[PDB]
């Protein structure tokens, strides 16, 4: 069965460069182009470009020219996307998809690339750093518990209906 | 440069209801030498990549039920579900599969509104569908808070 497995670094500082990998098994790698797709948190989908493995020919969305570079390693059935000069605006899940005659009919699972937005903390004392660091998990918990309550509100009417049948 | 527009944005539904999403392209998706409109439809559930349902405007992929019918031509396309089932509660995207740059619609979300009209298996699937849905929002919280910790951590060990 067709498979595209994605690997790469998840967390990067601004100005970093990250090389995402996409390992294709179960089909003749050279018989299909490879597309790369960016999905930001707004769920907006944006095509970055494709590569032809037989010729190493590329086509880029002008919006991603320079920002992304597309390579393949035919020997190992692997395609690569290098993201450069990373900004917080580059935070997204990145997909590789196989693209032949029938659009993007198989997708990798996606590599989530998070760019922290990044100095003043250097001068803070150890007591104040650990304090802030201690305040964040209580904050993160309460924010998640809001979500759990949001979905508990949708689960309850469905659970009730099952219980009655 | 081609621009994709879908409608409606959201869509409440119910058991066995027929739904119809529109997709309109700013330019013809009709390749006349190929005798083919190169429009594609994807179904995306939270946590998973988009999945191809239809290519070439009307061709269902393997494993796509007959309930999904794509139609249209030139610049106007629709995707129709004859009898909506719980597993169809997703987001749907159309795509210019015709000219570079390839472009995507913003989507059409089949949000269910409000239940005994559903089977037992349909209510079970919708319940099991809320867990990856919730995990998406939660995982995003963890992302945001994982960043805030980094400069703090680096600063402690300088």
């Amino acid at each position: 069965e067709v498979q595209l497995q994605q690997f790469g670094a998840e967390l990067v500082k601004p100005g970093a460069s990250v090389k995402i990998s996409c390992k294709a098994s179960g089909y003749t790698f050279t018989d299909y182009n490879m597309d790369w797709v960016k999905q930001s948190h707004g769920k907006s989908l944006e095509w970055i470009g494709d590569i032809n493995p037989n010729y190493d020919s590329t086509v880029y969305n002008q919006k991603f020219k320079g920002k992304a570079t597309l390579t393949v390693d035919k020997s190992s059935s692997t395609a690569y996307m290098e993201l450069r000069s990373l900004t917080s605006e580059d935070t997204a899940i990145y997909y590789c998809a196989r693209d032949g005659a029938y659009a993007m009919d198989h997708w990798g699972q996606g590599t989530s690339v998070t760019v922290c937005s990044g100095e003043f903390l250097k001068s803070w004392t150890v007591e104040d750093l650990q304090k802030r660091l201690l305040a964040l998990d209580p904050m993160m918990e309460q924010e998640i518990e809001e979500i759990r309550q949001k979905y508990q509100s949708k689960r309850q009417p469905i659970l009730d209906a099952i219980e009655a049948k | 440069d081609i621009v994709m527009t879908q409608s409606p944005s959201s869509l409440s539904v119910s058991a066995g209801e027929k739904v119809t999403m529109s997709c309109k392209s700013s330019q013809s998706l009709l390749n006349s030498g190929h005798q083919k409109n190169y429009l594609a439809w994807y179904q995306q559930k939270p946590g998973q990549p988009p999945k191809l349902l239809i290519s070439g405007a009307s061709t269902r992929e393997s494993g796509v039920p007959d309930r999904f019918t794509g139609s249209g031509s030139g610049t106007d396309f629709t995707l129709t579900i004859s009898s909506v089932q719980a597993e169809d509660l997703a987001v749907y995207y159309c795509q210019n599969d015709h000219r570079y740059p390839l472009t995507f619609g913003a989507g059409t979300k089949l949000e269910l509104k409000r239940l005994k009209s559903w089977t037992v298996e349909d209510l079970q699937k919708r319940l099991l569908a809320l867990d990856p849905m919730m995990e998406q929002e939660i995982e995003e919280i963890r992302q945001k808070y994982q960043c805030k910790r980094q400069p703090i951590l680096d600063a402690i060990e300088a």
Binding site: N33, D50, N52, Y55, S57, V59, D99, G100, A101 | N31, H34, K36, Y38, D97, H98, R99, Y100, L102
Partner: peptide
């Protein structure tokens, strides 16, 4: 380069 993208 591709089957029909252009």
């Amino acid at each position: 380069h591709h089957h029909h993208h252009h």
